[PDB]
Amino acid sequence: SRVLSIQSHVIRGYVGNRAATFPLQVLGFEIDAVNSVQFSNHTGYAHWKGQVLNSDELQELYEGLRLNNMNKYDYVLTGYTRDKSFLAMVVDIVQELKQQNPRLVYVCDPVLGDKWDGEGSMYVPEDLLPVYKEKVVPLADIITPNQFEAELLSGRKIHSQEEALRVMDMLHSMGPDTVVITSSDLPSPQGSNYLIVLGSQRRRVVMERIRMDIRKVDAVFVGTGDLFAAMLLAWTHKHPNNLKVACEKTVSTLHHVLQRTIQCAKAQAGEGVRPSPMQLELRMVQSKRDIEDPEIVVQATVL
Numbered sequence: 001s002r003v004l005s006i007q008s009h010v011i012r013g014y015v016g017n018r019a020a021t022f023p024l025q026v027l028g029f030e031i032d033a034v035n036s037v038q039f040s041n042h043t044g045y046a047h048w049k050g051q052v053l054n055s056d057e058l059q060e061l062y063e064g065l066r067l068n069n070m071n072k073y074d075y076v077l078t079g080y081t082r083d084k085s086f087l088a089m090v091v092d093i094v095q096e097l098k099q100q101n102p103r104l105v106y107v108c109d110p111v112l113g114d115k116w117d118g119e120g121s122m123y124v125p126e127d128l129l130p131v132y133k134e135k136v137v138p139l140a141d142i143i144t145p146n147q148f149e150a151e152l153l154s155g156r157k158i159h160s161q162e163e164a165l166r167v168m169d170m171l172h173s174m175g176p177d178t179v180v181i182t183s184s185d186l187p188s189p190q191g192s193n194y195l196i197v198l199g200s201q202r203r204r205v206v207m208e209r210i211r212m213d214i215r216k217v218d219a220v221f222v223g224t225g226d227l228f229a230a231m232l233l234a235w236t237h238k239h240p241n242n243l244k245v246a247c248e249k250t251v252s253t254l255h256h257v258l259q260r261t262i263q264c265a266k267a268q269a270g271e272g273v274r275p276s277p278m279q280l281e282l283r284m285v286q287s288k289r290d291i292e293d294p295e296i297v298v299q300a301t302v303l
């Protein structure tokens with residue numbers, strides 16, 4: 001199946017299309033990558049340099065595809081975007097691909113910000129929020145917000161597992177049939193060193209709801225949300241009425257990739273020292289085998 005993925009590209013590193021392309025390619029997807037920017041590296045480094053793609057250029061590329069009658073996709077995948085203009089153009093393109101193919105699954109990662117301590121802080125210009133609420137989310141079939149993004153998109157604050165699942169009911173009714181909170185503050189009965197993933201799916205009307213408790217690792221990675229979105233696309237494709245298994249394969253893939261990265265990062269920086277952003281880049285290529293067939297290392301709680 002064919003996938004149009006519209007996100008950033010970096011030369012060194014694994015974020016946006018870098019984090020989503022190889023893994024989806026490995027899994028047999030015909031993925032076409034629209035590079036929404038081309039930077040030397042991600043913005044977590046001390047320096048970066050590169051160019052952005054403006055919305056007129058995005059339309060040019062899309063016309064290119066239409067003129068050849070190539071504008072027929074089974075999926076669209078979107079992520080981190082800085083310009084409201086660019087985002088609005090993305091909306092028009094999906095509108096049209098959906099008219100071209102009404103069975104198209106739009107996977108949207110509504111990247112807005114994150115809870116970098118306890119207070120959440122926006123990563124993105126504020127005017128993007130309305131476009132997301134009003135234009136993007138109502139179009140999406142799968143969204144993958146973290147906790148902060150779920151709060152923003154819903155208006156409501158999320159402090160418990162039950163608030164989280166009600167906020168997921170709100171987002172369901174905004175459009176998307178699959179909602180997955182990709183990380184949260186929520187407490188785990190297993191320790192402080194945990195991070196909660198919640199998943200919700202509407203199907204032929206039945207609900208499936210899952211929870212996963214995930215052992216935190218003491219480090220900030222980049223591209224892991226992008227990787228989550230891409231793998232959820234891949235795994236819900238293979239297990240379309242099984243959000244439980246699809247989420248277990250997604251998160252296990254993440255474990256294996258991160259495991260390898262942290263083991264590698266510690267070795268590069270020396271026993272004792274905390275590693276740099278460079279040493280923390282996902283060891284993507286080396287995780288080839290775990291992407292093809294991840295060993296399940298977390299079980300999901302049905303909810």
Ligand SMILES: Nc1ncnc2c1ncn2[C@@H]1O[C@H](COP(=O)(O)OP(=O)(O)NP(=O)(O)O)[C@@H](O)[C@H]1O
Pocket residue numbers: 109110111112113114144145146147181182183195197214215216217218219220221223224225226228251254255258
């Ligand atoms: N220490 C860690 N740091 C970052 N990610 C982790 C860590 N441990 C596990 N993960 C995995 O990374 C996944 C996504 O989390 P994260 O990278 O915070 O994306 P997000 O903030 O949920 N969404 P986005 O706004 O696209 O970045 C989680 O579901 C975990 O599987």
Ligand SMILES: [Mg+2]
Pocket residue numbers: 114146183
């Ligand atoms: Mg995060």
